[PDB]
């Protein structure tokens, strides 16, 4: 179990160690053979090395089995040419490992239904994993242009693009509740038709997973009316962007959300929140998203599903008994982490 | 005030007269000079004439100033070649009048916050009008195709297309709270950039209306977290499809929703619900969407904003004191209508 740790900026060093504290505790209890090294990345690497993703770090993620990544960026580096912005270092990283699926889960932890914008009865039991295609579709499609008179962009998908990301959805589903909803616009668009027939054909190799197709306008409505009905959702790039963002508001606190990216190379697991530099070093940063990034790593990078679930329960419980300040509580980074470990035992 | 009335199918005859009863009452009180005629349309016209939009009806909407339309279709006609399906008659109608904007309002009536999927505090005061471009964008754009290997569709907009639908949003806003949010994907797409700069330029002729730009992924999130913040939203075809459908679940009852379509020709105002043929002639159909279609006609077809608002309040009140069966009540079509008229006085 070889993990490259890229702490990043702002609160990154704090919350990433909070996750390492949890990974070490499991390493000890279960003998996971955890071996990790920490590399420079983001703003700190610019300051130290002159660039956000220096060669030792690139080398280090190349050799690792998973990357645990803290937060990156901050006003400190907003004034840079974007060949060396923190943002661009993030892109090279995911590009260097050819990560073509983005995994974004939204989950209303029991007893935290009050945070939801949804009525308590609808928020309860929500646990949806959106699988977003990352590399293709309209964000990248040609031809594209703009005129005095008109502009155009092309939503375009090749079979292989549709095939990869569908395979990761089915394998993810295998680890959860084995239901996949593929989302398209097959009733109006060729691309929708092509996506659907392709995912239907891919699904034949996964007899143990249930497959269902929905239109993007309908899935949008289901995510507000009955979001507890979903397990894994897979869709193209722009749809998956909208539906990820829509699903992310359901729990009522963005600081709680982890994120993974999978592909041919070394997978990247990171919290969705930012650096929050203002509080860097105060010891109050909520480590929840980082710890749940580590659980995502166990599940998706190493297949240790039962441990990922053990970690997720420890934080569900910790969130109730020692809520961090941004859930109205007074638990600093360390006190919260300690509560998690208590339940890990 | 010359209205062509196209009752349609199923519950269409019932709910459309419930709206006419309300229009007559106002005609009497205010001397509006209401003159209307009822034309065959939809399944009934197929049965009577052999087609859904026969020539007397086409003639009749041509000469009118607004079309008040009931529901169309039903299993009775599901087995038809779609050159004469009810659905297609609907298309010819909107095509024959060149209606290029779809207006879909979502509104949580005071005291009906309990129906919302949203927490009561978030649902309260929601009143958003989505203005959807109807004729353009990816649903219609070329080139488009599909291969063994790939499929493609083109999101394409000309300046004039962006200009019309923006003008109707600004004029709609003028009648409401004078805030327009244009929704694009300007941070990734040319088409987003082009839409945005065009709407910004159109907005200069409407100094009295406030304009704000949002991305589609963000507007999606705002519609769940803070939907009471919106007044008028204008966006392209596929986005407006998603955001219309998303906004439509906010009130918690689809049977309540009206719809208008505006263009160069005679405007069409219709309930969003279907024929519900099973209950046709029982006298229990909820006329709310039809009556609120008539209020939409007053506002958008004739500019009678204060009357539209008077009608909307009468039904807000009627919904509380004599709820129709589908709001848990026992009010049939006539009893509900009567309650509306009581408050119209």
UniProtKB/Swiss-Prot annotation, chains A, B:
Q: Site positions for Important for catalysis, renumbered to this chain?
A: 139, 185
Report the main location listed first in the record: cytoplasm
| GO terms for biological process, alphabetical | L-leucine biosynthetic process
Which GO cellular component does the record give, naming just one?
A: cytosol
What keywords does the record list, in alphabetical order? Answer: Amino-acid biosynthesis, Branched-chain amino acid biosynthesis, Cytoplasm, Leucine biosynthesis, Magnesium, Manganese, Metal-binding, NAD, Oxidoreductase
Specify which residues bind Mg(2+) according to the UniProt entry for this protein: 217, 241, 245
The cellular location(s) given in this protein's UniProt record come to: Cytoplasm
Domain of life where this protein originates = Bacteria
List positions binding NAD(+).
74-87, 274-286
Question: What molecular function terms (GO) are annotated for this protein?
Answer: 3-isopropylmalate dehydrogenase activity; magnesium ion binding; NAD binding
Swiss-Prot/TrEMBL cofactor(s): Mg(2+); Mn(2+)
| Pathway stated in the Swiss-Prot or TrEMBL entry | Amino-acid biosynthesis; L-leucine biosynthesis; L-leucine from 3-methyl-2-oxobutanoate: step 3/4
Family label: Belongs to the isocitrate and isopropylmalate dehydrogenases family. LeuB type 1 subfamily.
Job of this protein: Catalyzes the oxidation of 3-carboxy-2-hydroxy-4-methylpentanoate (3-isopropylmalate) to 3-carboxy-4-methyl-2-oxopentanoate. The product decarboxylates to 4-methyl-2 oxopentanoate.
**NCBIfam families from the xrefs?**
leuB
Query: Per its record, how is this protein called by name?
Result: 3-isopropylmalate dehydrogenase
Report the source organism.
Thermus thermophilus
Gene transcribed to yield this protein: leuB
């Amino acid at each position: 179990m070889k993990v490259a740790v890229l702490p990043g900026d702002g609160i990154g060093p704090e919350v990433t160690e909070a996750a390492l504290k949890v990974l070490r505790a499991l390493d000890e209890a279960e003998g996971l053979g955890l071996a990790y090294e920490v590399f420079p990345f983001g703003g700190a690497a610019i300051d130290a090395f002159g660039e956000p993703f220096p060669e030792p770090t690139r080398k280090g993620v190349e050799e690792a089995e998973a990357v645990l990544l803290g937060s990156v960026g901050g006003p400190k580096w907003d004034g840079l040419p974007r060949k060396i912005s923190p943002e661009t270092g993030l892109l090279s990283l995911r590009k260097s490992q050819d990560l073509f699926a983005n995994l974004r889960p939204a989950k209303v932890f029991p007893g935290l239904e009050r945070l939801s914008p949804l009525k308590e009865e609808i928020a309860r039991g929500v646990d949806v994993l959106i699988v977003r295609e990352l590399t293709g579709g309209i964000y990248f499609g040609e031809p594209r242009g703009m005129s005095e008179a008109e502009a155009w962009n092309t939503e375009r998908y090749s079979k292989p693009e549709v095939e990869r990301v569908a395979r990761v959805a089915f394998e993810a589903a295998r680890k959860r509740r084995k239901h996949v909803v593929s989302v398209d616009k097959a009733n109006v668009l060729e691309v929708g038709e092509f996506w659907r027939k392709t995912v239907e054909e891919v699904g034949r190799g996964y007899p143990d997973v249930a497959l269902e197709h929905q239109y993007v306008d309908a899935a949008a409505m289901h995510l507000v009316r009955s979001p507890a009905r979903f397990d894994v959702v897979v869709t193209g790039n722009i749809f998956g962007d909208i539906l990820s963002d829509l699903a992310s508001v359901l729990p009522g606190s963005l600081g709680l959300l982890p994120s993974a990216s999978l592909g041919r190379g070394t997978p990247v697991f990171e919290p969705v929140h930012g650096s929050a530099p203002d509080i860097a070093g105060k010891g109050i940063a909520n480590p929840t998203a980082a710890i749940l990034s580590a659980a995502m790593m166990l599940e998706h990078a190493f297949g240790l599903v039962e441990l990922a679930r053990k970690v997720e329960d420890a934080v569900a419980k910790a969130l109730l008994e020692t809520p961090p300040p941004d859930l109205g509580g007074s638990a600093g980074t360390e006190a919260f982490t300690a509560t998690v470990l208590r339940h890990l035992a």
